[PDB]
Amino acid sequence: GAIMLDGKATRDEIFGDLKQRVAALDAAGRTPGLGTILVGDDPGSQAYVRGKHADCAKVGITSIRRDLPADISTATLNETIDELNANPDCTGYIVQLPLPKHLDENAALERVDPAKDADGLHPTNLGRLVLGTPAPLPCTPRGIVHLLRRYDISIAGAHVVVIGRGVTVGRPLGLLLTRRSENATVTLCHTGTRDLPALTRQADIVVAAVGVAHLLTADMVRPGAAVIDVGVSRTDDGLVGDVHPDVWELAGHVSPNPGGVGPLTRAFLLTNVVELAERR
Amino acid sequence: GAIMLDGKATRDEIFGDLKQRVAALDAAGRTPGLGTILVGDDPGSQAYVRGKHADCAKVGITSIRRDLPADISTATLNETIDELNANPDCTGYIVQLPLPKHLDENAALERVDPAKDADGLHPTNLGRLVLGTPAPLPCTPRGIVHLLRRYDISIAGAHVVVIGRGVTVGRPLGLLLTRRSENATVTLCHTGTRDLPALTRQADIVVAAVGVAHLLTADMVRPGAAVIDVGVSRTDDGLVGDVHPDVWELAGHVSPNPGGVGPLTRAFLLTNVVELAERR
C-alpha cells in the first residue's frame, strides 16, 4: 500500500534546521520575533495562538503577544498594527481571525506591513505571487510542496489536481505550483466541478483541500498517485479529513490527516519568520 | 465553421452602460478621470495612450495626460506617480510600459496607489482577487469571461483549459474563473505541460494565451468547444496567433485575434475606472 508522507518527522527536521538558523541570528545580534494580535476570547483562536507561540519557544523565536479585549476601537487596533509594523524585534506577525464584528477585518489585514507578513496572506504578497515578485509565501502551500519534495515526488511536469479553493490553501496553491520553479500542470477543482472523479483519476498528485469528509475515495485516484490530505471538517464523529482511508490501498503515497500537512503548516510559519530575519 | 466570437457589439454594449454610469457619477459631482504616465519616445506606447484617451472621451471620462521625456530620473517618475496618487481629479491611472531601461519598472508599478490602479495589475489588487476583496480586475481575463458569457457559453461547471501563464492573462484568469461567481473547473497548462492535446481535448473552453504560433491545432480541440485566441508571437511573416486556422472547422466558437477579446480588454480598463469612482 501507500507510503506514509510523515509530516511530524518532516516538521521535526525543519525545527532542527530552524533552531540552528535562529542561533545564528541570535549570534548576529538580532533574535527573530513572531508577534500575534489576538482580539477577544474565542477558545479556538486562543488555542491557535498558544500553539504558534509554543512552536516558537521550541526553536528560540521570541514570542510577542498583543492580546486585546473584544471591545477595542478601530483606532486601538490600528495603533497595535502600526506598533508591530514599527517594532524592530517583531520580524513578522499574524492577526488571528475572526475579529469582533464591529471591526473591519480586511482593512486590518491590509494595514499589516507586507514586509512583516509571516502568514504570507497579505494581498500585496499574494499579488506578488501572481506577478512573480519574490515575497512571503503562504505556509500551507509551502508545506505541501516541501512534503512532496522531501519524498522525491516529482512536481515539474506532474499533473496535479487541487480540490478546494480556500484563500489560504487551494487558491494560492494553484499559483504556487504553476510557477516556473515548480512547473506542475494544475487542474483546479471545487464544488462547481462536474465529474470530479474523471479528473482526479488523471492526477499524478491529488491535493484534497475542500473540507468534505472522506470525499476522495480509492475509486477516484490513479494507482500510484500521491495524495495530500489537507481539508478538515466537523462531523458528529469528530474532526475528519477529505480522504477516505481506502485510498491507502492504491495510492503510491498518502499524507495522513492528522500528522501530514498540518505540522508543516506551522513549520512554515516559523520558516517564514526566520527567512524574513535572514533577508533582514 | 465555428461561430466568430466578435467583440465589437459587446464592447458597444459596455460603452453604453459606462456612459450612463458616468453621467450618474457626474450628477453626483464625481466625474471620473483617467490618467496616463507616458515616458519617452516609443511610438506604439504613444498610440496606445492616444487610444485610451479617445475611449475615455467616448464615455465622458476626463483625460489626464502626464507625458515625460525619456531621460527622466527615478525621482521625477516618483514625483509624477505621487502627484497622480494625490490628484483628486484622477480616479485611476496607468503607467505605460515599457519604461526607459534605467528606470525600475516594478518599483514604479508598486508605487501606484492600488486605489487608483486602472489596469487591475497592482499586486495588492491581484492579491485582493485571490482573497475575494472587491477591487480593479485585470482587463484581459474580464474580457475573456464576458465575451464567453455574452455568446451564451456556459462558465459555471465548464472545464476550461488555459494554455499559458502570463501574469496579466493566464495566471489571473485561473483565479477569476475559479471564483464562485464564475465556478469553472480550470486546467492550467504552460510550456511545462506534458501531453497538452490530451488535456485540451477535454475542454469545453480552450484559452490559448501562450504566445506560441499555432500551437492549438484542430486535433487538439473537442468538436463544438469554444476557443479563445489571445496569444500572439512575432514571426517574420510577422505577428501570428496561438490558434491554427484549421480549428475553425470543428470548434463551436472561436474568437478572432484581433477583434475578439481585444475590444473588451480595452473597454474593461474603463470599467475599472468607473468602478473605482462608484465604490468611491
**Which range marks the domain in which residue A247 is found?**
1-6+138-257
Whether B278 and B28 have beta carbons less than 8 Å apart is answered as no
Amino acid identity at B154: S
For residues A120 and A67, membership in a common domain is answered with: yes
Q: Determine whether the annotation assigns residue A7 to a binding site.
A: no
Cβ within 8 Å, pair B167-A130: yes
Q: Say which residue the cell 484568469 belongs to.
A: B173
**In CATH, what number is assigned to the domain containing residue A198?**
3.40.50.720
Which of B128, B183, B184 lies nearest to residue A123, judging by beta carbons? B128
For residues B21 and B1, membership in a common domain is answered with: no
Cited resolution, angstroms: 2.0
For residues B212 and B268, membership in a common domain is answered with: no
For residues A264 and A126, membership in a common domain is answered with: yes
Q: What is the 3-state secondary structure (H, E, C) of chain B?
A: CCEECCCHHHHHHHHHHHHHHHHHHHHCCCCCEEEEEEECCCHHHHHHHHHHHHHHHHHCCEEEEEEECCCCCHHHHHHHHHHHHHCCCCCEEEECCCCCCCCCHHHHHHHCCHHHECCCCCHHHHHHHHHCCCCCCCHHHHHHHHHHHHCCCCCCCCEEEEECCCCCCHHHHHHHHCCCCCCCEEEEECCCCCCHHHHHCCCCEEEECCCCCCCECHHHCCCCCEEEECCEEECCCCEEECECCCHHHHCCEECCCCCCCHHHHHHHHHHHHHHHHHHC
For residues B199 and B68, membership in a common domain is answered with: no
Q: Which of B120, B145, B138 is nearest to B255 (CA)?
A: B145
Q: How was this structure determined?
A: X-ray
Cβ within 8 Å, pair B125-A127: yes
For residues B211 and B276, membership in a common domain is answered with: no
Interface residues on B facing A, Cβ-Cβ cutoff 8 A: 106, 121-133, 156-157, 159, 165, 167, 171-172, 174-175, 178, 180, 183-190, 192-194, 199
Q: Say which residue the cell 505577428 belongs to.
A: B239
- Name the residue in chain A with its Cα closest to that of B182: A192
For residues A81 and A39, membership in a common domain is answered with: yes
C-alpha cell at A139: 505556509
For residues A107 and A54, membership in a common domain is answered with: yes
Rounded to a whole number of angstroms, the distance from the CA of A274 to the nearest CA of chain B is: 23
Residues in chain A with CB shorter than 8 Å from the CB of B188 are: 174, 178, 185-188
**Looking at the 3D structure of chain A, how many domains does it have?**
2
**In CATH, what number is assigned to the domain containing residue B90?**
3.40.50.10860
Measured between alpha carbons, how far is A163 from A170 in angstroms, rounded to an integer?
7
Degrees to nearest 5, angle at CA B10 with B61 and B139: 60
For residues A132 and A13, membership in a common domain is answered with: yes
Secondary structure class of A234 (helix, strand, coil): strand
For residues B26 and B143, membership in a common domain is answered with: no
Secondary structure class of A15 (helix, strand, coil): helix
Residues in chain A with CB shorter than 8 Å from the CB of B156 are: 192
Measured between alpha carbons, how far is A172 from A248 in angstroms, rounded to an integer?
27
For residues A124 and A173, membership in a common domain is answered with: no
For residues B270 and B204, membership in a common domain is answered with: no
Residues in chain B with CB shorter than 8 Å from the CB of A184 are: 192
Whether A184 and A160 have beta carbons less than 8 Å apart is answered as yes
